[PDB]
């Protein structure tokens, strides 16, 4: 969120920050190295990404 001092909008919109155009290509490299091991599961956020 805003409040967290590790203020990250993911690495998706970091990618749109350094790209700066609304239709890039993203390489979401090594999707199969996503496990649920008490740090949260980011594959469930990739469910929103794809």
């Amino acid at each position: 969120r805003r409040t967290y001092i590790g203020a990250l909008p993911g690495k998706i919109i970091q990618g749109m920050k350094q790209v700066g155009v609304v239709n890039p290509v993203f390489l979401l490299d090594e999707i199969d190295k996503l496990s649920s091991d008490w740090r949260g599961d980011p594959a469930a956020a990739l469910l929103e990404v794809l």
Partner: protein, 49 residues
């Protein structure tokens, strides 16, 4: 990563860095607990005993 060496945004400083001139050497003790994208891009030299 050389895709991100040439565009290195240290998000404290929030400025892009060109780390192509900055010459890293990674060094380690075993091949197992290096992370996997830090292995195949990386040039294994393999000093023996």
């Amino acid at each position: 990563d050389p895709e991100q060496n040439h565009t290195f945004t240290d998000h404290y400083l929030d400025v892009p860095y060109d780390l192509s001139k900055v010459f890293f050497i990674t060094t380690a003790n075993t091949l197992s607990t290096i992370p996997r994208p830090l292995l195949d891009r990386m040039e294994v030299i393999e000093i023996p005993g």
